[PDB]
Ligand binder design. Structure first.
Ligand code: HEM
Ligand code: HEM
Lengths: 173, 173
């Protein structure tokens, strides 16, 4: 049922009066096209994050970056906490990062990229999942988990991470 | 269907050696407890935002605030774009904002709160939906849509927004 709680000093105020005073001090956040940042976006509680891509740029130089493509969700503060899981199809490495809103993320000056990775992990595996280990590894500048996963795939072609890009392109054609 | 793409200059590079060079230039974003902000969080593309609460503070005075409770989803860049929909149950008003991560949002010095609003809209209604008009209204310092909705609820009690909080509380007991 509809209910109202209030500090007792507002007992004799009308609802209209109160909301007029609240709005007066609040002002206008100007949540409009071209004007939305973290200062006026507001925020959500209780939710997870999802998307066909996750991307991040270096804080050391703000240029070096990677883009993970697939079907990913991140539990954020839901349990198991701070777990990335789902399907990791692709990984692009290079300099500069554009898009991410009404267009996909893209590396501006691409070096190298991998497609058809076919890596997946369940929510319940938590931080032990391969997708989480790979992507979080890369956020921390640690390629070890990625290289272990790539060695697993490349094993089918008699290759490894010590193979060159030309060798890998030759066997996977 | 594993594949690779690369700038021709990396043809004779080993995968291992490329990733070594990428990682040593990327560094470590330091995505750890207490050290995560927007500068080192990364981002997702193609996704939606949801939660049991939405909340926001004034950009002018950094204090006046509200918290909307219920079951909410915001389409973000998915169509119909920038639409808040679902069920709106509660709305609390006052000064200060606490929590939002591992605890619910809460107003620090509450003035007034409304429960059992029982308002709901669909994604397909877009910006015409009542949950969107109410909350976007409040974000714009514009209580008009809220007051229309409250007059609807209150007319079944023979009251309106010009009634006092004591009178509303008496009728809704
Ligand atoms: C949940 C309550 C929210 C509502 C009702 C809402 C509604 C809107 C509306 C109606 C617009 C554009 C229409 C205009 O120009 O008048 C807009 C823009 C935008 N909002 Fe929201 N929004 C909400 C929360 C958020 C959140 C949590 C974010 C996350 C960062 C966000 C990000 C954006 C962005 C990036 C834009 C447009 C930027 C641009 O196109 O230049 N909004 N919002
Ligand atoms: C998508 C890939 C991501 C992965 C794999 C990831 C992983 C992690 C991990 C493992 C932790 C805990 C590490 C520790 O205990 O030191 C953490 C903390 C955190 N992450 Fe993420 N994260 C990702 C993206 C994001 C995003 C998009 C946000 C949203 C802004 C975010 C916000 C946070 C916050 C606020 C904390 C810690 C806050 C605290 O307890 O002090 N992360 N993340």
């Amino acid at each position: 049922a509809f209910s109202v709680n209030y500090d007792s000093s507002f007992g004799g105020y009308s609802i209209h009066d109160y909301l007029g005073q609240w709005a007066s001090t609040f002002g206008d956040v100007n949540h409009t096209n071209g004007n939305v940042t973290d200062a006026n976006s507001g925020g959500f509680y209780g939710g997870s994050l999802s998307g066909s891509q996750y991307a991040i740029s270096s804080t050391a130089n703000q240029v070096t970056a990677f883009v993970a493509g697939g079907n990913l969700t991140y539990t954020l503060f839901n349990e198991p906490a701070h777990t990335l899981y789902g399907q990791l199809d692709s990984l692009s490495f290079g300099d500069g990062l554009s898009g991410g809103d009404t267009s996909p993320y893209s590396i501006q000056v691409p070096d190298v990229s991998f497609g058809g990775l076919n890596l997946s992990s369940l929510q319940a595996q938590g931080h032990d999942g391969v997708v989480h280990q790979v992507v979080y590894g890369l956020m921390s500048g640690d390629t070890g988990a990625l290289e272990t996963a790539l060695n697993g795939i490349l094993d089918d072609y008699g290759l490894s991470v010590n193979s060159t890009f030309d060798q890998v392109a030759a066997a996977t054609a």
